[PDB]
Design a protein around this ligand. Sequence first.
Ligand SMILES: C[C@H]1O[C@@H](Oc2ccccc2[N+](=O)[O-])[C@H](O)[C@@H](O)[C@H]1O
Ligand SMILES: C[C@H]1O[C@@H](Oc2ccccc2[N+](=O)[O-])[C@H](O)[C@@H](O)[C@H]1O
Lengths: 269, 269
Amino acid sequence: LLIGVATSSLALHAPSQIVAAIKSRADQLGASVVVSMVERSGVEACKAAVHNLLAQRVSGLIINYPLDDQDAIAVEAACTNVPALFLDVSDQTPINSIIFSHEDGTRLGVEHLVALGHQQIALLAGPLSSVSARLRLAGWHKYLTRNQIQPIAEREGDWSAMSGFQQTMQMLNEGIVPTAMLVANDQMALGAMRAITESGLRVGADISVVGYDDTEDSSCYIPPLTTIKQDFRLLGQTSVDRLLQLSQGQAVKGNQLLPVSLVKRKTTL
Amino acid sequence: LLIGVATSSLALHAPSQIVAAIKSRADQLGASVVVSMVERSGVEACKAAVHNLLAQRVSGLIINYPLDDQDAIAVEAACTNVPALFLDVSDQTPINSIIFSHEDGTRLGVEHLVALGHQQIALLAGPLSSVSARLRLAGWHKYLTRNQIQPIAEREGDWSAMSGFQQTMQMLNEGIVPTAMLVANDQMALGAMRAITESGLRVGADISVVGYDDTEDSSCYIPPLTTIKQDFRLLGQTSVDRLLQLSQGQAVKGNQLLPVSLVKRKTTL
Ligand SMILES: C[C@H]1O[C@@H](Oc2ccccc2[N+](=O)[O-])[C@H](O)[C@@H](O)[C@H]1O
Ligand SMILES: C[C@H]1O[C@@H](Oc2ccccc2[N+](=O)[O-])[C@H](O)[C@@H](O)[C@H]1O
């Protein structure tokens, strides 16, 4: 009936897209969404707004806000005898989550790139505050080690495209010249390919970028971005209608991993 | 105490930044914010919330849906009680506006093109139901005309990146090559640029593109996108601040418009 969505700042395109999509499904069956977004970072953050939300007596919550194992648990503790679905935690966190497959997203990147002939694979990560980022990092490691490779350089941004510039455009100012980079989201990838290009190198043939998300935009980057689609109009649906039977008292009582795919475009060669 | 925000799909970027900016001031004052999301088409659309958003008893309303001239009051009535503040109408309506000086905005863009040498200019419109898109075209139109200039081509579009592509292509494929395009917003200007790019041409140098927004993403297009900057931060600060000032009688009344600027990047190199 009325769904509250607490969501990490809507600036970044991804959760702004989740929100868009949570709605489109609640619309598909006349439920109502009220989104509340969180300050910045902190657990206290997410709670303050979870409150702001519970105060509108939403018939059920969807918590799309990066949270470590511990914090995450306390938020549910606070989620107060009302259906509560987490979208940005680890699956090892023992509550009510639906998160995309970090094991799968990270394999496919390394997987594809290793088989492409690449050796010098730079890593650009989300900020390590975000749980999802840390998984996606660890993720890449596992498969680069399983593959017996050291990353020539790993790095941190903040999901902002400009980070993908500043940071990738610095790695290069140090003689660290990869042949591929695995970029933690697409927005920073935009930065990455922008930096690579301007610093005088052909993206794709010269330093191939694999982004992460297939956000709405990225079909149009130049050239357009090989990436890891997470299907947000599904995390949209499944989560809406999970919270649905979940309101009625009708399972399922844990964590559902969602699959991914590699959208192979024009920045890998 | 609690501010309600109605908005066109969050999936577009600017409303987000706006929504996010509305927060950062509510944050600074100690207001809470709740945001609900308009079905992207109709007025039915928009006032089929505002309601779904008064079921929460919001201290005031900040309304970011494009509203034609009739629908404007047709809605300021529906609230009435109940202070409200439209963010997306004409500076011509007896409601309480705050918009961006499209005269200034559209001119700035024309002028710059005009002084830069061009006389073959295309116009990429916003969606013609968005009055904010309309107000712009006419701005371009009147100033473009004042220089005794006619556009080569005029195309519509849905604000989205993919249309910027779909449409710059449908243009070019006709055999219309402008030396510089005027484009409703940056999300579009992106697909705009990639369309140029792919049909063989150099962005800027062969067809310069002028955006409208300076969304966060824009400084990292390839190349950095020369655009008009609507300082969204300010709109938050101004509208949130004005909304309190409003809900206590002691407030300014009619439309209250605020300025914009041309940012010179590398798309008019
Ligand atoms: C905050 C991050 O959201 C990530 O999406 C993540 C990824 C997996 C599951 C949930 C979320 N989330 O936001 O709830 C994006 O991959 C990244 O661009 C960034 O926006
Ligand atoms: C719907 C449009 O919003 C525009 O911003 C508009 C433009 C002027 C005044 C207000 C708004 N608004 O959204 O409240 C953007 O220029 C454009 O990207 C598009 O998303």
